[PDB]
Amino acid sequence: PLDFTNSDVVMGALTKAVGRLCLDVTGYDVVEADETIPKPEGPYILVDLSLLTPLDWATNEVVDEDGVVHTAHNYTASYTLTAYRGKPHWALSRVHQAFGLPFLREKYFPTGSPYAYSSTSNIARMRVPLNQQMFENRARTIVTFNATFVEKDLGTFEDIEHIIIGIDVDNPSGPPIGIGADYDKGVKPGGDDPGLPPKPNPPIVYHDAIAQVCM
């Protein structure tokens, strides 16, 4: 019943978050590298998940109700953006500045989300010949994001229901004394003994004297 959002969900939703912010700021059209289609008409941007870096040691462990363990790891995903016509260098820059606008981020990067923005690389403008007739304007940049991935274990170990301890007290008056100790899940050491009587709270009464001394 203690569910979560595994890696597959976070990773897939990060692409769409980048896709919507690029569309909503620059006004260009967007496309991914996952499947190929004939080149669209007009300026557009291409999104690719070029690289992914892990961080070695897990930062948190969440124990299910039944004992299963969910482990959380920090990551960093890098996206390669490319803008293909119009003023591509201008288009990419407005994407960069978008991460500094508070209201715009809150739509797609709400507080508590499993991914965040980290930094950006240099924006390089390029000219590429086409059919040996024309030079096409382009650009390229790499945007680095933070993330956190959670995965669920494949089982649990047994609980400790009963513990048995052997004790040996070496002494000089005779042979060592062997004696054992034991623990059980529901057996209190004292049973349910009430214990010593408590110190009572005196009842609230009226006093005539601010400070009275009586022998």
């Binding site: 109700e65 004992g67 301890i165 007290v169 070496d170 100790a181 050491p189 004292g190 009587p197």
Partner: protein, 437 residues
């Protein structure tokens, strides 16, 4: 199916008296006034025991009293001599009385005691050397010691070997064990129950076979010696009328075994100095019947040995370690499970028992001096803890969810008892090698 006691129980002594003052099988008191309110007659057995227990230097905080069905009392003058106003205290159904017999022979005194027939419900029956007092179905009677030279004896239809399994089931939060019955069968039954339930059995006896010559004897001390139990026995003259087990307990109930302290010389108020001669002392020392010798104007216990020759303090220390480890492990395992973080059976969790056990039970002993540490020979005395790995645990134990073969080792740091000197007086004083050996 012995359930574990806790720290408070480790100090509570239980006395198995005969009475009917409360319906329950056991009750706890913090002073003799509560017992007085419950209708115990001043000078009664349980009252004497409670007074002695509270009168010690290391007295316990609370005392538990058991119940064994009473049938009829006895006021015995047989074998006594009296030249003083005999007095007997009697409490009847919350009504407190006193009885007086003047001055003469014990038989005449016993006969004259039949005058206890006024303002009564209960009945009195003289027999020429003792008076048998028997109550009636709705009446409750408590008979207590007074200024006379006599001993009060009670009888019951039950037996210890059948009463005790009821008291323990009712409540188990007590450590010491004592009883009012003084027959050999009752004493042996108490010893056998105590040794099986990990409880310390105490008793005082007045049999002269303790003094009897070492060549041969058939005393209860000797029977326990043969059976090789751990009951702590002592020979006292006034035991049968004062129940001095309370005084013995009052001198050892409060001091924790972490100090390794023994019982050798502790003063016990209420005890009467031993009277026999040195030959009798030597005889008694053979049977492990400890005595309370009066030396240099004071009283002092002697060597506190158990029935099987072992010292009392080592046994008590081992029991203390057992109970403390049980309590510590339970506490830690319960705290771990209060959160949803229960201890699993894996190699990433098992080791923590080392620190858990080092903290509460063992480190206190090492601090206070009860556990020896250091280096010997080619051995060291440091306590050691060994824990198995998941690969070594049998599959059946995995299925049952049980951990076995956790082992601990310690060394006890005993105390000193005797000293000998070789003084010499001379009118004057008498090889020079001067080379390093």
């Amino acid at each position: 199916g012995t359930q574990p006691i806790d720290t408070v129980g480790f100090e509570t002594p239980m006395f198995l008296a005969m009475h009917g003052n409360f319906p329950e099988r056991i009750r706890f008191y913090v002073s003799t006034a509560g017992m007085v309110a419950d209708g115990f007659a001043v000078g009664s057995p349980a009252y004497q025991f409670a007074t002695n227990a509270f009168a010690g230097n290391f007295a316990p905080q609370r005392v538990a009293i058991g119940r064994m069905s009473i049938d009829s009392s006895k006021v015995d003058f047989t074998g006594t001599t009296n030249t003083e106003q005999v007095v007997v205290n009697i409490t009847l159904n919350k009504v407190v009385k006193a009885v007086k017999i003047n001055v003469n022979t014990p038989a005449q005194i016993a006969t004259a005691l039949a005058d206890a027939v006024t303002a009564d419900k209960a009945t009195a029956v003289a027999t020429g050397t003792y008076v048998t007092v028997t109550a009636v179905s709705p009446n409750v009677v408590s008979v207590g010691k007074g200024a006379g030279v006599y001993k009060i004896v009670n009888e019951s239809s039950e037996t210890v070997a059948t009463v005790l399994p009821s008291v323990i089931a009712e409540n188990h939060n007590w450590y010491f064990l004592a009883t009012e019955a003084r027959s050999d069968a009752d004493i042996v039954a108490a010893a056998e129950f105590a040794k099986a339930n990990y409880k310390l059995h105490i008793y005082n006896s007045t049999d002269v076979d303790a003094y009897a010559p070492e060549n041969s004897a058939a005393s209860v001390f000797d029977t326990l010696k043969s059976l090789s139990y751990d009951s702590l026995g002592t020979s006292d003259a006034g035991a049968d009328v004062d129940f001095t087990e309370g005084s013995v307990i009052g001198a050892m109930a409060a001091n924790d075994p972490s100090y390794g302290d023994s019982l050798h010389l502790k003063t016990m108020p209420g005890m009467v100095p031993f009277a026999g001669s040195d030959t009798q002392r030597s005889n008694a020392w053979s049977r492990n019947a400890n005595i309370y010798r009066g030396l240099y104007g004071g009283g002092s216990y002697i060597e506190g040995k158990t029935s099987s020759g072992q010292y009392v303090d080592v046994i008590r220390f081992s029991h203390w370690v057992k109970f403390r480890m049980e309590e510590s492990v339970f506490a830690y395992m319960k705290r771990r499970s209060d959160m949803g973080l229960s201890m699993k059976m894996s190699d990433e969790d098992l080791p923590v028992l080392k620190s858990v056990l080092m903290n509460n039970p063992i480190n206190i002993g090492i601090r206070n001096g009860g556990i020896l540490t250091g280096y010997d020979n080619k051995v060291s005395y440091d306590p050691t803890i060994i824990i198995p790995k998941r690969a070594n645990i049998p599959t059946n134990d995995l299925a049952a969810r049980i951990l076995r073969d956790v082992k601990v080792e310690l060394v006890y740091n005993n105390s000193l008892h005797y000293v000998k000197i070789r003084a010499s007086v001379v009118l004057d004083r008498p090889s020079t090698n001067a080379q390093t050996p």
